[PDB]
Automatic annotation (TrEMBL), chain A:
Name the UniProt record assigns to this protein: Bacteriophage Mu GpT domain-containing protein
Superkingdom, taxonomy of origin: Viruses
UniProt source species: Pseudomonas phage JBD30
Residues of the full protein shown: 255 to 304 of 304
Automatic annotation (TrEMBL), chain B:
Protein's name in the database: Bacteriophage Mu GpT domain-containing protein
Species of the source: Pseudomonas phage JBD30
Residues of the full protein shown: 204 to 254 of 304
Protein origin, superkingdom: Viruses
Length: 50, 51
């Protein structure tokens, strides 16, 4: 019986914040492509890890 | 005619500033997060005198 998982959090170090925000935070891609992963998961940036 | 003044510059703190040696911005992929925001991230990543 499969399990219902709804990922809504993305935790990354401060060194990956740029990539995390450009995956979730960018609305247009290329010369206009929407973004299927825009605001799908909210990101928090922390300095304790790494 | 003369001017007189008492002053001198200061260093605020060693770990609150940065200067890099490149700025190209060609297509905003050479330095967007390679050397312009790389320093931004470096400032984001620092540790005090307690680990």
């Amino acid at each position: 019986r499969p399990l219902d998982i709804r990922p809504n959090l993305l935790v990354v170090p401060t060194t990956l914040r740029s990539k995390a925000k450009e995956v979730v935070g960018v609305q247009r891609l290329a010369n206009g492509a929407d973004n299927p992963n825009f605001e799908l998961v909210q990101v928090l940036d922390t300095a304790w890890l790494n | 005619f003369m001017a007189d003044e008492y002053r001198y510059g200061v260093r605020s703190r060693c770990n609150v500033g940065f200067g890099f040696w490149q700025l190209a911005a060609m297509s905003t992929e050479e330095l967007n997060q390679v050397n312009f925001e790389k320093v931004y991230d470096a400032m984001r990543n620092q540790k005090a005198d307690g680990g």
